[PDB]
Design an enzyme around this catalytic site. Structure first.
Site, short mmCIF file in Angstrom:
data_model
loop_
_atom_site.label_atom_id
_atom_site.label_comp_id
_atom_site.label_asym_id
_atom_site.label_seq_id
_atom_site.Cartn_x
_atom_site.Cartn_y
_atom_site.Cartn_z
N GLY A 1 2.10 -1.39 7.08
CA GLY A 1 4.18 -1.65 7.21
C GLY A 1 4.73 -1.86 7.91
N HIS B 1 0.53 -1.50 -0.09
CA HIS B 1 0.08 -0.21 -0.49
C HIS B 1 0.80 0.97 -0.21
CE1 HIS B 1 -3.62 -2.01 1.32
NE2 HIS B 1 -4.69 -0.98 0.98
N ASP C 1 -0.36 -8.08 0.95
CA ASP C 1 0.07 -6.08 0.69
C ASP C 1 1.15 -6.29 1.63
OD1 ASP C 1 0.07 -3.88 0.38
OD2 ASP C 1 -1.49 -3.63 3.22
ZN ZN Z 1 -6.40 -0.54 0.11
#
Ligand code: ZN
Length: 227
Positions: free
Chosen positions: A180, A39, A86
């Site tokens: 993250g 992201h 992700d």
């Molecule tokens: Zn998203």
């Protein structure tokens, strides 16, 4: 981090701040590699290491540039976007100095246990409804919950690559700006915070984290091809 506390000075030496048009967390896994969320993908980045206070003159403070980024192949950017896969690796311009403030953390070698106590850190939003960047690194202790508790995990077979954590009662969560960063259960790095849009810390709404254990093979191979 909503409902957490200030981390003790340099108690999370592997925690980095990844900055571009987004604030993100990152995790030092090698002097030369940082894992973060996909992201946070951008043309450029500034990596901050060895910091407690994002806006302070700190001694172990380091800043690195990125040479190359590698988003997990299966991540679908915001074809319907989801938070599975992700993950993104950042290959640093030049290695981080391993000091009394900057240290690497190990990849996990065992499967996380539902109910284990986990800690998450970040400079993300401390207010669940609106975005307030925290100057000081925040820490919060949450629990590893059953994936059954996280609605996102029911899609396809994404359950496989996701962990679900927080408190059913709400009040404690990762939030916007925390993406993250790490999720450490029983002392192990087990997850990577995914997208944490407001509102956060909603009762009965635990969050999604990348089940790291499932990506070490991909992580391994990449670092291997990028000497
Ligand atoms: Zn998203």
């Amino acid at each position: 981090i909503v409902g957490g506390y200030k981390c003790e000075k340099n108690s999370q030496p592997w925690q980095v701040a990844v900055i571009n048009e987004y604030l993100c967390g990152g995790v030092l896994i090698d002097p030369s590699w940082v894992i973060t969320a996909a992201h946070c993908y951008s043309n450029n980045y500034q990596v901050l290491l060895g910091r407690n206070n994002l806006f302070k003159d700190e001694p172990f403070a380091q800043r690195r540039l990125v040479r190359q980024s590698f988003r997990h192949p299966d991540y679908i950017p915001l074809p319907v976007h989801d938070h599975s896969n992700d993950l993104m690796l950042l290959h640093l311009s030049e290695p981080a100095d391993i000091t009394g403030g900057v240290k690497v953390i190990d990849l996990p070698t065992k499967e996380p246990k539902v109910g284990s106590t986990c800690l998450a850190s970040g400079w993300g939003s401390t207010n669940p409804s609106e975005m307030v960047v925290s100057h000081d690194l925040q820490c919060v202790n949450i629990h590893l919950l059953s994936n059954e508790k996280c609605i996102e995990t029911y899609k396809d077979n994404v359950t496989d690559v996701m962990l679900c954590a927080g408190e059913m009662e709400g009040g404690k969560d990762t939030c916007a700006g925390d993406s993250g960063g790490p999720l450490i259960c029983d002392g192990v790095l087990q997850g990577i915070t995914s997208g944490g849009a407001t509102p956060c810390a909603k009762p009965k709404t635990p969050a999604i984290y990348a089940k790291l254990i499932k990506f070490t093979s991909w992580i391994k191979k990449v670092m291997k091809e990028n000497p």
